[model samples]
Target: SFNRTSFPDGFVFGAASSAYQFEGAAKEGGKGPNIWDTFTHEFPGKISNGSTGDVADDFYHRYKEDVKVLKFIGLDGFRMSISWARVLPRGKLSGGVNKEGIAFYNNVINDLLSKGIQPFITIFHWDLPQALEDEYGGFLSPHIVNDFRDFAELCFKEFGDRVKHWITMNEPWSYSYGGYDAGLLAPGRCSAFMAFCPKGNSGTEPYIVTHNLLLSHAAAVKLYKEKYQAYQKGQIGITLVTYWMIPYSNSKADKDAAQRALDFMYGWFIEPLSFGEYPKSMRRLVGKRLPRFTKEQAMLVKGSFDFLGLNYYIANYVLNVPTSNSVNLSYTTDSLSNQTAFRNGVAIGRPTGVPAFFMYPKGLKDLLVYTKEKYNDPVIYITENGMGDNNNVTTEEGIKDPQRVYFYNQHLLSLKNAIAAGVKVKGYFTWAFLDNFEWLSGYTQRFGIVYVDFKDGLKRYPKHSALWFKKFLLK
Candidate 1:
């Protein structure tokens, strides 16, 4: 497993989790509150030591002992999300359906298809069903694209015949730059001049909560491609998180400020899901406060994804700054650009205990060969590459992670060198499988390959990077 090769035949070897960073049943059963359960109990000092996923890592009475430790770490895919107020509890549909939150995700999707895994699912990971953020200020209202497409067509009419890979939303740029421009996650709202915000307008509510979270991810992939992907043959997508910029110097003004900070953080959501528009470097740097996609919402957000999850952990540098902060407006100083990681004194990576992550892994094969030479070739996954372990170690040093088994063996050999450079790359998920509740750095970062004993009752061990992904997905 150390020499590492496999991962090609039908790729997909997973481990990822959300629904409020590992579902803790915040007040159980037909659960309702979200917005990270009212932003960690109404500002319990914005989380960290004042934690709360309201009993996290408990995984809602423990997801069958974390699905038997994701089938003893020989995962074939799990990803998991769905908790839009645990299935529409007042999010909409006139606030009705919650048959025990659709019988608890149909008993965790038929026990992960009786353990042969492959669930992927993720319809919204930032959890905003605090009654649609107190009636309509949720994604900053286009009445949240028909209540997020009626809670994504009630999760494709109750778990689309056993969930065949839908994603809809996970990182609308970390929920519009961490809940409205660094108010620092979860409906916190910024712009009280950035000093611990609670009001907001960090320059137009993160482009109006990422243009109503891209019209509620193109109205839930256009009502799951006009009513449940052709009778639930399933395959909808959208995950989008980024970093890979890298140009602090080599001049052309820090290389066009590292391509205008990757066209304002990943061509502002992959050029409106591959060709609908938004990043002419965010329309000439937020001109008239950016928001345009008109012609029938750019032909229903262009090719509204059949796939392209991507998460990649770290890669920064950037630099070229002064395009006038223009007196305290923000989107963290809109694409003028300036992020570091370090250069002259070294360390662009390999440092993780999560100081906003550092382990670079060739920026995940240079962001999958720059998203297949700039968003043309699509179908990709790497949904979230792992790295985190600062929870003050010693649960036997968090089960002996050898730097998360060398950061998943150099990011699975940078996804086998971006799938031998062609880059259609199908799957690879691991940003966590256990050590839960890490929102606002609560539970203090321990991006699990399973060692989760948060004071013992929440026990589970595994971790030599989950037996190096159970011997690299068993082979």
Candidate 2:
């Protein structure tokens, strides 16, 4: 029963979308191909239902209509990522900037501003230019740091005037694990041992990719702080996603395992950004396979963010697992902990469309408090939080997302409590604005408060949750 008035003044509420997930002029607007284009077409089998984002919600052509949806919802802001390939089609300055792409975003940002909506821009959101990936193994080499910095600087130079809030990267952990470890997302690569894996070292590549991702983020933040923030006056940070881990049992081992799992997941990027090093558990467990940052790099990475954009959707109950003696190694098994959504056959909370996702509002407040206590209480934004429904549902069923309204209501209550407890939370943005292309899962899952009618020219229909948000904002 929480409303906008329940939160602090200046607390922002918005909806978020990614270019790859929402924009579908993949080859138009002079936008060169990104890894997603390659992944979905070349390895269609890797995606659920053999689907791709080739013609996703078509936000590229229909963003004006979408902006109207944002206005109607009474959002204070809208969060969306700039497609790197759209700007720098080749992912490097030498490749030349695409004026058409620049003009497209300028139009979009201007339209949002005219409607009194602030733009929260994410510079990178997992759609690495296929050129970069092809050139030298994108995010696997240190070479990417400079290229990423250049791309970020370009975005700052071009859009920083109207865009005060900037997110440098979105969910490096998901990129590393899904792409390199699990081979479940774009640029699918995993150990040859795993089915359908084109090529990857599940154990080593994820660490390496994440190391580069952190370095890339640090470099971008450093550039912005030194060159742009003073003049452009924009804030930059990275978005990270992790589910809260609850110990499955009261035993010390289970408790320790829960913490360790958290360290491996949340702490991986946060520890480096906070303390300038990987988690002690990661360093000890992964040993030589883990990359090390030079003193210069460490200094650059520490204190890299102006805020922390956090995404929370689900919580897991964790049990300790013994180290495996098998020769085959993978990041999935590196945590030495197993997670489930149930205990003693009782679910953690109500089930949802997303597999393994359950309602757990306490987890959000717990995570916020733990973050404040553990990570120096950085400025935080709940950048992504919502429930998904199976896409197979009828349009009427999809539009009546009462479960989503309940999910957001519960989480907002938890978020408000966390703020009351001094968590430094600044804003909340739901996972998606429209049900578009969900990576790997494809169109199989719908996580939007606004339902996109894929079967009907990709038209959008506001769901019950959207109406709830409108009422909450109006009140």
Candidate 3:
């Protein structure tokens, strides 16, 4: 079947994971408390079964074992993040660095390479040191620019040789809004939610935090290119979590809403990185106005990426409606509102179960072709995509994940179409290698190729779809 087309020469097939999600060394390697570690334990009724990531997958001690899993799955590469907090627990350039933390990742990187598996490293994946949060509100502070660059520099000097591809930051949207305003996840806070006589601040806190996050990412990329790239001989870029948005209708109102929707979602980060300015639509939707980067900053910001890490999941429907007073006038509020869906005369709902990311498969082709036209056909990696289901879909002997198998096959065939059109598609890594902690949703959503038996000490069982991938790629 794969004879229908061939992937790019040397194209990598891989899977990804983050530190806190899998590495259960919360108290090891001199790691100071991460937000998740503290948040889960601090709030008694917070996580499922009072679940802290204290010993989630025990990957810290079992990384070699996990690498064996990667090999068994026939991955050409394995993407993972270096826990920023574990490396520099105090989150400062001057603070003492954790050698044991460095050693642990060194072992992981070297071990994967020794087995002929490439290591794709992401510098930050939302595991901030509690020290930074206490000091200057973390990402919301400008001080993060220098601190993040320093952390990145240490990483480059240490492991950049083997870690040839570096993702500067992963999904800033989740880091900013999910943590700051949504109040649905860790490091839980809303400027007013401490219940101190004020009650309406959470609605606006997320946007303010996003502005800061954008600046931090651009600054880090600028620093890496200037200080590290030439000598390190590595590629660097940031990951934006994006999905195609379909206009509900061809009406002008729906069309305008669809454009504005992207500004609020993807452009929140993209405009800044590409033009050193927030999108004009963002200024209209967000505060008095979004901040402006100076020409010098813009110059530094230009050409920041060797490639874009595209994390695709599902497409969303957008609609246009007359601004309503009931909706908080925030960018996220108005953009994510069903008013757009209603005004554009479209119903927005996904199907339940395995095919949960119910967007049409062609959305993948459209996104690839569009990114090529809009962003100069930059090299890209399908950094994340997969499905989740319950009902113990696997048999006693194995997992019968035909739905998941279909998901990858359809997507891969679509990827072939994009490649035919000259889109520089470089690689694909499933959303996860194993079904582990999914942040706010916890273990409730199972988006993995390898199912983790969380009920029994986090044992992992290879699903049928995982087998399908190995054979599919081998051909």
Find the candidate with the highest lDDT and give its number. 2
Clashing pairs in 1: none
Evaluated at residue 225, the lDDT of candidate 1 is 87
* Residue-wise C-alpha lDDT for candidate 2, range 328-347, written one tens digit per residue: 69887888899988898888
In candidate 2, the residue pairs with backbone N, CA or C atoms under 3 Å apart (3 or more residues apart, or in different chains) clash, namely none
Off by over 4 Å in 2: none
lDDT of 3 at 284: 64
lDDT of each: 0.84, 0.92, 0.75
Residue 461 in candidate 2, Cα distance off native in Å:
0.8
TM-score, every prediction: 0.34, 0.99, 0.91
What is the alpha-carbon lDDT of model 1 when measured against the actual structure? 0.84
Q: What is the lDDT of residue 8 in candidate 3?
A: 74
How many residue pairs collide in each prediction?
Answer: 0, 0, 1
Please give, for residues 1-475, the per-residue lDDT of candidate 3 as tens digits. 6632388778889998888888887998798887788777876465655666787778898788888888887888887998988989898868879999999999999999988899889988888888887798777677777888888888988898778899888898777656765555666765553452122245565666676666666677777778877887878888888767778778778778877777777877776666667778777666463556678767666567788888887776766767765744443564543323222343343342533356356778888898888767788888877766753544343366777888888888888899899999888898788777777656666777887777667787778888888787673
Which ten residues in a row are the worst by lDDT in model 2? 323-332
**Model 2 lDDT, full chain set:** 0.92
